[PDB]
Design a protein around this nucleic acid. Structure first.
Ligand SMILES: [Mg+2]
Ligand SMILES: [Mg+2]
Ligand SMILES: [Mg+2]
Ligand SMILES: [Mg+2]
Ligand SMILES: [Mg+2]
Ligand SMILES: [Mg+2]
Ligand SMILES: [Mg+2]
Ligand SMILES: [Mg+2]
Ligand SMILES: [Mg+2]
Ligand SMILES: [Mg+2]
Ligand SMILES: [Mg+2]
Ligand SMILES: [Mg+2]
Ligand SMILES: [Mg+2]
Ligand SMILES: [Mg+2]
Lengths: 223, 125, 66, 180, 86, 186, 156
RNA sequence: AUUUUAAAAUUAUUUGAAUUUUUCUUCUUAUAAUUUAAGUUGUUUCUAUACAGUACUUUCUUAACCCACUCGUCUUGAAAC
RNA sequence: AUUUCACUCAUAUUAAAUAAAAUAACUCCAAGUGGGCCAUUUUUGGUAAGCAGAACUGGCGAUGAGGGAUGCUCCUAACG
């Protein structure tokens, strides 16, 4: 009864075709949004009005200090954000509660708003996964779509572009996708910092503020 | 430093000598762990004796091989070297220190007929 | 020679080593010294209920096994 | 095109208001023009001044625009006058200065350097009021009057500046500073 | 399973198409429109000036008015303060 | 460095291996580890775990409580990982099927005279591989006398713990701290 | 020597407020209490019988006993590495029905009808509360005559 | 001793449709091969037509460059005048 | 009050967010300690002190590596 393999072989092919179609529609969505924003602003200048943009919903946060000499409330928040050592990095969702958590630890981090290509590069060059029974997880690098579908195909994500979509926009499946990834471990920047002592918004060289869209340039130098 | 010949790697070749054994002759060179406050070797000061640790361990696949690339087995008479007829490519023999010349000649002659090598087949000649 | 006489330096690090433990959240507590003339009546109520339950169960057993 | 000669100062135009409420459902709108290193710093200064002057804090306000004004004739030479306010070690003062440049932020770059060199004033203790352009008949400072004569000539008396590969350490004849 | 070398998911074509079943089509389309446009040097790029004449004249008046207004407002504030200071 | 608790290493707390050197018990442990692994049934896992516990956690079970526990389970098999003892307070015994580690001579005789049978664990592994119609039971684990000394110290308010005394009588620790007549009670 | 009395350190805690002296009202004696209720312990200094201890002024607990004029309350207290349950017996004037619970009760009552209606029309309902989030985009109309320009001020 | 398999990619014949209209245009809708898949393979030379040589392995001795206060003990604190 | 029967109250997005949250909870048998000191901020006595006495946190002690020429406690950062 070698039929035990053929039905599986057809199931895999159908799954692959479905993933292809979903990815093409994602590309359509990206282009459409990018073009619509570029026209609303142009119309605002004509009718004597201002067009205030939607705000961001996602940030990427990097740690800047080591493990010695920290107050306990800082250590608790670092533990809850899953940032445990020097140059780690994770995605965070934007709410009232997470903003207040992020005010506690501001002088020790820097963060910003990530673009689609930055998300793709992070997921393809430095993307690892937790595999196993609950509380036994075995960090693995992706290399294939089997692990993703096995754990997360109940919410209809089958492959790496699905989670790129769900991360770049706060899709209905964000908690699961974000929690599925291991914390990113990153190199030091290729041309150094300015001064981790001082803030980004200070009139000196400094690093520790919220750098809104300049985060992409920094994390392309340590990727 | 690291020494590598074939696939066998040794992480260190120098010995670990006891602290202060070059200065006092009542202190023998065999390694003893330093206990005692203010030692400078227990506290890992730079520029002094190093301590041995589990990190210098050897690869499990090549842990007891000689440069011959075989394991060593020590025999005391002709009959003790019976088991080596089945695994004559992974083992080499060495003759014990307190066997007479007459016994050694027999052991060497049988080892030749079995196609097993002898490490020290030149003693007491 | 004099000495120190007080400090609670290092005391809440020791307190947090094994965390701040909590009460146990049981379902019943003992009514030993609480409002009498109310729990004696409760004893009577429960005895009556138990009598009725046991009598019905025993009668059902008696007819079932015949 | 030569990054060894660039300053990192640009000009921005920011518009913002307060979040509408029931006691105020169509609030006032505000604009400024700020010089900074990037747009994030310009927004930071905008909210700092919104708090100091009006009763706006960023937490109950919203932002409407961030433009980054560019300059129209970047190769014609203008005259500029600047109004300041800064803190010393023992008090606070306000000042008027004049510069010659081809861009407003080019003049602001000179102003920060001069206020650091002459008075040890840090960028954290300087507030900039009212950069503008001034006609040549209304210039006041003598070091700018020197530069606007009819036929301006002078010799070049500086020492040579040479590439690193021609900057040789054993010479065979001692060189000359004259250069006619 | 035994672990092997982790292959570069971006610059290794076979594994890139393994993870993304749509990348081949997208890359091919990009290459096609890249070759078209570079082949159109001195044949196209001549009318792009015409569309410059088409729509920059459309947007120019609006942009010019906006910046004129900002500058005039800044100047009015200056004069209003200078009159008060006297 | 990195901020883990217990350097990321997971902790476990129970007994990990047999201490006993009895060869038959080692054969039993091998057999039931194999059964638990290759047929994960939650019945073989619990058994494989229980026959590793120390002596104080394999208490005896008497005949009367054995019969009382199986009163509503006719034609079923009871499984115990301790010893069965006789009970002279019972008048009559039913017909039962029981598997356990040890039987005392009197209990073994009484069981077989009423038409029942005694099984060893290698027979239950052969006839009931997945424990169908088998009922797991254990005896009292906190009836030992040593447990009567544990808990709150005897001297705290309202403690039930026994003290360690030479002997018992009116002359041995009954005067000051045990009655209101001598300065306080307990 | 040291002075640790029962009412030590309560000079301002146990004093009446401005123009608010005098004994309590008559409706205070008509309050309803039941077992398991949440309650606040607030000392009233004009009744000296059955006052609580200093520590418990301002805490919240549950009722475990009701008497003729008294109520027993269960209250947590931190002792140096743990939390202990304390049994506090106070008189009825130093007792107030707790308001810490009311949002949950109103939420339950109100969500009941929404669930009943949604299932009656066979819809999909979400009833969990929403955290404040990011704001969407909008088009804001503003006449140019209404924008006022500001700049830093000189010193005076 | 049977997942270095399946799939994916490639190349050359094909069975049909699109569109971006094409010597890298798409959709494994049929067989063969190959690797870019499925963690390094090949060709020449030397050691050498040797049996311990001045070459290779190894142990001592003596230089350089950087670094290195006397152990044990009591003590908040020891190279300690 | 309690007890017995009926009907019914969101879940797979988990009755607000986040979480290498079970590395949990609880019993038993025991060691060593009970002379401390230092830094930022708050703070008492004294003209003041490398003086004496308190509070929260981080350290030295029990700890080495790079920098501060040198240095038990400063900056970066903790060790196969
Ligand atoms: Mg460089
Ligand atoms: Mg630097
Ligand atoms: Mg610091
Ligand atoms: Mg060795
Ligand atoms: Mg020491
Ligand atoms: Mg490590
Ligand atoms: Mg030197
Ligand atoms: Mg030196
Ligand atoms: Mg000590
Ligand atoms: Mg001393
Ligand atoms: Mg010493
Ligand atoms: Mg001295
Ligand atoms: Mg240290
Ligand atoms: Mg110095």
């Amino acid at each position: 009864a070698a039929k035990k393999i053929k039905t599986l072989k057809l199931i895999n092919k159908k799954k692959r075709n479905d993933l292809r179609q979903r990815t093409l529609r994602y590309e359509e969505e990206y282009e459409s949004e990018r073009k619509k924003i570029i026209e609303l602003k142009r119309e605002a200048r004509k009718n004597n009005c201002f067009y205030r943009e939607a705000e961001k919903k996602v940030v990427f946060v990097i740690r800047l200090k080591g493990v010695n000499k920290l107050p306990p409330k800082v250590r608790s928040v670092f533990r809850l954000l899953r940032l445990l050592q020097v140059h780690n990095g994770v995605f965070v969702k934007v709410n009232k509660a997470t903003k207040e958590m992020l005010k506690i630890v501001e002088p020790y981090v820097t963060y910003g708003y990530p673009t689609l290509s930055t998300v793709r590069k992070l997921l393809y060059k430095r993307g690892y996964v937790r595999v196993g029974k609950v509380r036994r997880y075995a960090r693995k690098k992706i290399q294939d779509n089997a692990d993703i579908s096995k754990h997360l195909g109940k919410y209809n994500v089958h492959g790496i572009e699905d989670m790129v979509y769900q991360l770049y926009t706060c899709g209905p499946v964000f908690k699961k996708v974000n929690n599925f990834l291991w914390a990113f471990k990153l190199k030091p920047p290729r041309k150094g910092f300015k001064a981790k002592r001082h803030a980004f918004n200070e009139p000196r060289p400094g690093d520790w503020g919220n750098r809104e869209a300049h985060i992409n340039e920094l994390i392309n130098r340590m990727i | 430093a690291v020494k590598k010949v074939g696939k066998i790697i040794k992480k260190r070749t120098k010995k670990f000598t006891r602290f202060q054994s070059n200065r006092f002759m009542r202190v023998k060179p065999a390694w003893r762990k330093p206990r005692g406050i203010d030692c400078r070797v227990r506290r890992r000061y730079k520029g002094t004796n190093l301590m041995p640790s589990i990190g210098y361990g050897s690869n499990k696949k090549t842990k007891f091989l000689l440069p011959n690339n075989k394991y060593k087995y020590v025999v005391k008479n002709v009959k003790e070297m019976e088991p080596l007829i089945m695994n004559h490519t992974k083992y080499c023999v060495q003759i014990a220190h307190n066997v007479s010349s007459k016994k050694r000649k027999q052991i060497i002659e049988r080892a030749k007929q079995m196609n097993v090598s002898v490490i020290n087949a030149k003693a007491r000649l | 020679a004099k000495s120190k006489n007080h400090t609670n330096h290092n005391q809440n690090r020791k307190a947090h080593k094994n965390g701040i433990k909590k009460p146990k959240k049981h379902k019943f507590m003992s009514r030993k010294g609480l409002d009498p003339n109310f729990f004696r009546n409760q004893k009577y109520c429960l005895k009556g209920i138990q009598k009725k339950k046991k009598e019905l169960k025993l009668k059902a057993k008696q007819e079932k096994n015949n | 095109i030569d990054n060894s000669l660039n300053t990192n100062i640009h000009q921005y135009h920011i518009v913002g208001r307060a979040i509408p409420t029931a006691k105020d459902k169509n609030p006032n709108v505000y604009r400024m023009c700020i010089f900074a290193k990037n747009d994030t710093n310009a927004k930071s200064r905008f909210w700092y001044f919104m708090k100091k002057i009006n009763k706006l804090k960023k937490s109950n306000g919203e932002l409407l625009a961030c433009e980054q004004i560019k300059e129209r004739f970047p190769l014609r030479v203008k005259n500029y006058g600047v109004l300041l306010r800064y803190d010393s070690r023992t008090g606070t003062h306000n000042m008027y200065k004049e510069f010659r440049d081809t861009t407003k932020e080019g003049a602001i770059a000179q102003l920060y350097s001069e206020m650091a060199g002459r008075h040890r004033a840090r960028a954290s203790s300087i507030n900039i009021i009212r950069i503008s352009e001034i006609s040549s008949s209304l210039v006041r400072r003598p070091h700018i009057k020197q530069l606007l004569k009819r036929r301006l000539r002078f010799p070049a008396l500086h020492l040579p500046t040479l590439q690193k590969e021609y900057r040789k350490k054993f010479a065979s004849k001692r060189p000359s500073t004259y250069r006619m | 399973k035994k672990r092997l070398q982790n292959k570069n998911s971006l610059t290794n074509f076979a594994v890139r198409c393994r993870l993304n079943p749509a990348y081949k089509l997208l890359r091919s389309l990009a290459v096609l429109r890249m070759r078209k446009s570079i082949l159109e040097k001195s044949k196209n790029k001549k009318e792009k000036r015409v569309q410059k004449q088409i729509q920059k004249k459309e947007l120019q008046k609006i942009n010019h008015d906006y910046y004129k207004g900002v500058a005039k407002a800044v100047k009015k504030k200056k004069k209003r303060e200078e009159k008060k200071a006297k | 460095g990195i901020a883990l608790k217990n350097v990321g290493r997971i902790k476990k707390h129970g007994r990990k291996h047999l201490v006993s050197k009895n060869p038959y018990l080692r054969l039993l442990v091998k057999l039931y580890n194999f059964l638990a692994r290759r047929t994960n049934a939650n019945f073989n896992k619990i058994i494989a775990k229980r026959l590793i516990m120390p002596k104080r956690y394999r208490p005896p079970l008497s005949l009367s409580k054995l019969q009382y526990h199986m009163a509503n389970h006719p034609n079923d098999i009871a499984v115990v990982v301790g010893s069965i003892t006789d009970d002279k307070r019972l008048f009559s015994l039913k017909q039962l099927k029981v598997c356990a580690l040890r039987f005392t001579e009197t209990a073994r005789k009484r069981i077989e005279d009423a038409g029942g049978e005694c099984l060893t664990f290698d027979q239950l592994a052969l006839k009931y591989p997945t424990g169908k119609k088998c009922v797991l039971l254990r005896g009292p684990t906190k009836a030992r006398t040593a447990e009567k000394h544990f808990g709150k110290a005897p001297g705290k308010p309202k403690s039930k713990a026994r003290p360690y005394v030479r002997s018992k009588g009116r002359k041995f620790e009954k005067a000051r701290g045990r009655r209101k007549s001598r300065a306080y009670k307990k | 020597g040291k002075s640790r009395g029962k009412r030590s350190g309560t000079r301002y805690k146990f004093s009446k407020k401005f123009r608010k002296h005098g004994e309590c009202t008559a409706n205070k004696y008509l309050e309803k209490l039941n077992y398991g209720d949440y309650v606040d312990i607030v000392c009233d200094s004009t009744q000296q019988k059955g006052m609580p201890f200093n520590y418990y002024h301002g805490k919240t607990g549950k009722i475990f006993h009701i008497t003729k004029r008294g109520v027993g309350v269960l209250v947590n207290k931190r002792v140096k590495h743990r939390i202990e349950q304390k049994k506090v017996c106070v008189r009825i004037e130093h007792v107030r029905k707790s308001r810490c619970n009311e949002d949950f009760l109103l939420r339950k009552i109100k969500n009941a009808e929404l669930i009943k209606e949604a299932k009656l029309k066979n819809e999909h309902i979400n009833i969990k509360r929403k955290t404040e989030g990011p704001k969407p985009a909008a088009m804001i109309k503003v006449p140019p005559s209404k924008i006022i320009t500001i700049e830093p001020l000189p010193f005076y």
